[PDB]
């Protein structure tokens, strides 16, 4: 039913390079700061190494592109499309690791070595703790935005019902950090069971299984992923235990041990060490043969690059002096936290042409009716937030004038 | 006497793909919650990353299957069977590590650096502690369910120590894997219910009996297997209670005064599975079953196959928290805390159709191997007493291999 | 526009070896000490395993070079230039790790396992702590000095009302000079201007700027003179979790928590910061004391040392051991702390080894135009200094070139590797 | 001009095996013990896994060796010399790690997580601490003893000792660097308490690889291997006056309890981390086929130097004697000792070589080392002032290569 694009998309020998140049984001890693005197504007964005970067890369429409020689296709019977054959995700800034925390984290006791009876249950025992998150590197590439999975509140023990949800991963969405891919805002009502940079967020994980089994293969031309973590500490929660331990799993205590302590345990993660050798980025990927049926065809003259890279999640400390005095006083200083991200996206594109026979027109229409409509032979994604990368005026045919271009010519023997 | 299936099972060039689609299990990682007014009515099942997943995969009987053209075999003289030539065990959810504990764990002292005399006295010094378990990945494939080993209470036959006996049993869906405390029946061998965390303290932890399964004459249990285990000692504790076997007098000089009353030498460690990484993953990659080591080269007798999996690398337990009363300031009594765990699978197979010419010698051989094969071919089920995760593929077979992920991989890998 | 040097630079079979011999630096890893008079003299330089070493290597002008027979060179139509084809960065001293600290580090609480309410109030809760930094190995090679990136104080629009008074951040490019500090785990920033309390990082960077190589910019340079070749190995993990004292400049928004009361009414600082750790150093992961053959550069300059000079940039924290020195002010039969003075010193040992290949260029009209657009000084200096404002470790090889390759370690390696 | 020995040293097809047999050293790892009255005699030597082992291996002079048939060379016009073509450094004892410490280590505060103000004053705050040192494996081979580098006191706002880098011959028993650098601790640390006692009155040396590699003739390093590792285990600061105060532009002054600045004379303790079999450099053969330097294994002077550091067997054994036997335990009834042992077994394969004493070759050799021709008869040895572990193989040479382990390995490797 579905066939490879190799069977109805003809390749030319025409290649183009396009680069975004340096992309920077600067903000607060834990939360954005809205403008107090203009509520519709953000004063400081939320910029964190635990966010997805979802780039919507806009390509020049090859059917309107000022090629010097346009005799390679017949506009009466054919249309043009770009194919992505090479990519490098440039990453700036040094390798490093940031931390995240909560001034009122719901940690009660340390349950690793010593937690004797009786409990000391007050009504507000939250503590100001921080941690370093699970480490994640990944890149997804396709002509359709990626699909994530996360757990949320479903439809109806008083435990919230769990439902697995699919959604489009948007630029700025949070990746899972060690506490799972879930809607923490709705499933953790106390706002204190995870650090503040996810406690009112949804952490999403790429739905690799769903995307890979898509018939046309528009979501994943190519992907890399590297995750790691271990358990750094063991805590338990304050609050009522919603599901008591059944009586067949213990002999009751008495006296000092009569009032059972909370078995609502939770670990803290740690991503451990970051190293250059395990970097996925700053090297080229050649999209020669995709596993799916879309062999890199950028339908709609666009392409989506999704990236998570926690290996440069350093958060910088900033400190201002409000009063200059000869001796040190805390009240004379203000402390800030800032995080930055540096990207440089480089592509090699191959021009393709499609002869629109009756059979091919039916196939394309069944696959995506917008393709023929846009070819002349409202955009549904504008409700989503992406990092827009406009390459319409960035295409160059002089491949050997750019780093990735030289690599392509050398690799391909051209 | 036993020969390879390659000698009497004819391979065709007909291949079919079958996939389970998304399989989800959601529950409490530490215990099930029973309906108070029923016994087999579960309100919340026990779903944990430390459980065996034993999938009983039902295949369509090829002798009754709607093939478009069956002219490739003579039903008067031959019977059909599926062979598994490819499989990928898909795993969803992010990598992570969960913890387990006991609100009354029988830990007395930390015995790593400082445990001075004299012994502190008590009758209930249990503590509310947790740990992260040994890390295990494994994958078994066969047309017969897998066999486990575990230590249990033997026969009663200067020590009241329970006798130990090594038991074999079928590993069922939901059985607990060993966690760092060994493969034993904790319910019967640890009578106090407090020496290990609550998710195994009343369970039997089983380890696959690889040696027995591997030495089976016909080799139906293990077409293929992968395994990756690791742990280290994170902490050193000792037990409270009477020491059942005192240290002999030739191993120490007796103390006096504050050291006159000997402290408990019933030590026990806590395990740690250490780090989880993508590179060490066994799953989300294809396995091509070309040449089995045993005599059964992937033949799915009885139109079924058993896929057994342990994967602790996605054992994260999600914290859930409900608000009973909304108030402007934080109060512990206004919230309830829950724990939930989920597992996501996607089993993908490529099967090769095979035919067997039922000569006199071959029927004799097959009857000796398993008399049910010829009876079901027409030329009750003892496994109904066991619990498996049923995966019904009777309506999931497709000849359009290139329309599915594993199907494309198979066509590419085989040059077809 | 830009073409590979392979298209207009002719390679000869003439090879030369040159070595710097042992290069030593000795000083204080945390700060320099000035002569009280003379003020602009250094008494003890600042020498640290966390510094960049930027060697400006001077080569003999091959167009004036005493070759045994120069009849192969026609000065009427061609000029000579050296190409670097082999390099080894020798490192002496044992592998090891140093630590850095601050007697008044702005650490308030340990936020890893226990930090209950209420907070302890004070005005000066600084502590005397130390740490081991992120581990970095790198070496860059080109005929132009390298470019670093670092964050500094930018410009703040004043028409824009500031609800946050946080300093604006700007990414700055600069030439990396010998003695500049590498990033240590707290990022590449100007700590002197962006941390006004002088207490948020150890003293060896608290009044310094830590720089990171701008690899992306250097790689995208049209001619590729900065990076013939580079190697890099970074690693770190989080060793401890602390928070800062001082007023929190950006309060946590009210939608991320339920307010406290009583002991928890005054929120504690969420201005967290980790301490880094470079972890283990091993021989197996060393980048140095091994040869590199510069056969084919990724950029268009395939190792041509224009201007008869070469830049070697090195970071190597794997030998950052700081030696403890102790003098006895008064000899007594029993120990007393006041009888001794404690000092710290650090040393660095280098040995740079090169193999150069002689090249000649026939100066046609087309090539002269190309080179002039590339750099007009090349044709001027050939008869056919802007870098003096920067600080480099000068390595003069003008009189160290030898044709007897097999008389030297790297020369023997080259002859064997190339089959000569 | 220097040329390879390949150009003037003729190889024969004559090979010999030689082995040292078991070499044992037994002593105290921290210090030597003199005879209790007589003092120039040692009762217990200092034997530690942190020492260099420098073996001076004496070979039989081949020009005086009882060969059965000497028609392979002309003794009037030629001289004989041995070339080393194979070597294995045998190591006995199990892998393990020792620790070193000081009963009066100059450690003031733990500066890793908590070191608040004010500093408490004292005059003697030294502590009884220990640590495990940096891990080092290495082996050097040449016909000349190896050269080490270390920092010592040189000549000539700061009273800090001037530093000079010194070269010296590494002798048997010299200390390797341990994590505190290669320096003369006796002269540069006057308090004798800034490092553990096994180096506080010693010089820790590091091989001057750069100097030896650049020697024209290449006599020091036929071949070498090295593997070092460490991390920082703890962070401390020193007591005593700070000799160089922190400049005023690097901090804002304190007040009250923070008025008296604390010592920023930090120092780490090292740790060599784990030792494993897989990273072993020893107990495997090295074939010296073609050296990088110009001396291709020629053992001038009928000797060769094998230098080893191996901290991967640095276990220190605990010994304990009973002075009074009593029914209850008392500390004063026992004496505690520490002992360390090292087990070596050096195995060599040598190839016999001949040199024709032409006018040109005698001139070349005379310029290289005037002693070579003198010793050939065509005298105080200068190395007698240095200490080496003497290994005499004069009576250990055998032509029956296949009767010994390394000999068999050589025959197999070389196709003979």
Numbering used by the authors:
A (entry chain B): 20 to 175, 183 to 403, 437 to 473
B (entry chain A): 20 to 176, 182 to 403, 437 to 473
C (entry chain E): 20 to 403, 438 to 473
D (entry chain D): 20 to 175, 182 to 403, 436 to 473
Show me the paper's own sentences about this structure.
HPVs are non-enveloped, double-stranded DNA viruses comprising multiple copies of the major (L1) and minor (L2) capsid proteins. The native T = 7 HPV virion can be mimicked by an empty icosahedral shell, called a virus-like particle (VLP) which consists of 72 L1-only pentamers. High-level neutralizing antibodies elicited by L1 VLPs can block HPV infection; however, protection against HPV infection is type-restricted, and there tends to be little cross-reactivity among HPV types. Each L1 monomer folds into a canonical, eight-stranded β-barrel (BIDG-CHEF), with the strands joined via flexible surface loops (BC, DE, EF, FG, HI).
We solved the crystal structures of pentamers of the lead double and triple chimeric candidates H58-33BC and H58-33BC-52HI to resolutions of 2.5Å and 3.5Å, respectively. Further pairwise comparisons of the surface contours of wild types and mutants illustrated that the most distinct bumpy protrusions between parental and targeting types were located on the side-chains of K53H33, N57H33, K59H33 and K60H33 for HPV58 vs. HPV33 (bottom left), and K380H52, S383H52 and E388H52 for HPV58 vs. HPV52 (bottom left). By loop swapping with a few aa mutations on HPV58 L1—i.e., S80N, N82T, N84A and V87L for BC loop, T375K, G378S and D383E for HI loop —the resurfaced structural contours of the BC and HI loops of the chimera nearly recapitulate those of the HPV33 BC loop (middle and right) and HPV52 HI loop (right), respectively. These subtle structural resurfacing changes in the engineered regions might provide structural evidence for the cross-protective immunity of the chimeric proteins. H33-58HI and H58-33BC mutants showed comparable cross-protection potency as that conferred by bivalent HPV33 and HPV58 VLPs against both HPV33 and HPV58. To verify that the residues exchanged on the surface loops of HPV58 introduce a similar functional surface area as that of the corresponding heterologous type, we recruited mAb 4E5—a conformational and type-specific neutralizing antibody of HPV33, the binding of which could be redirected to H58-33BC and H52-33BC-52HI —and determined cryoEM structures of the 4E5 Fab in complex with HPV33 WT VLPs (HPV33:4E5) and both chimeric VLPs (H58-33BC:4E5 and H58-33BC-52HI:4E5). Similar binding occupancies and binding angles (60° for H58-33BC:4E5 and 60° for H58-33BC-52HI:4E5) were observed for 4E5 Fabs bound to L1 monomers of both H58-33BC:4E5 and H58-33BC-52HI:4E5 complexes (middle and right, middle and right). Further analysis of the mapped epitopes suggests that the 4E5 Fab binding orientation and footprints covering both the BC loop and the EF loop are similar for all three VLPs-Fab complexes.
